[PDB]
């Protein structure tokens, strides 16, 4: 009557599958929308200043 083994085990396959297929994948119009991310989450732009603060 304790399901606490599903929250726990939520998190663990998220940490690990995830890092096990990205190793496999590795082991084998994108670009413009990567920047544009990355220059909201830059620390130079104030936009991305006011985002770290709220979050």
Same mark, same amino acid.
């Given at each position: 009557?304790? !399901?606490?083994?599903?929250?726990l085990?939520?998190? !663990?396959v998220?940490?690990?599958?995830?890092?096990?297929?990205?190793?496999?994948?590795?082991?084998?119009? !994108?670009?413009?929308?990567?920047?544009?991310?990355?220059? !909201?989450?830059?620390?130079?732009?104030?936009?991305?200043?006011?985002?770290?603060?709220?979050?």
């Amino acid at each position: 009557q304790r !399901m606490w083994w599903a929250f726990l085990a939520s998190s !663990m396959v998220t940490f690990f599958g995830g890092l096990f297929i990205i190793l496999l994948w590795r082991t084998l119009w !994108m670009t413009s929308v990567k920047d544009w991310a990355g220059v !909201m989450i830059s620390a130079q732009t104030l936009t991305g200043r006011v985002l770290v603060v709220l979050v």
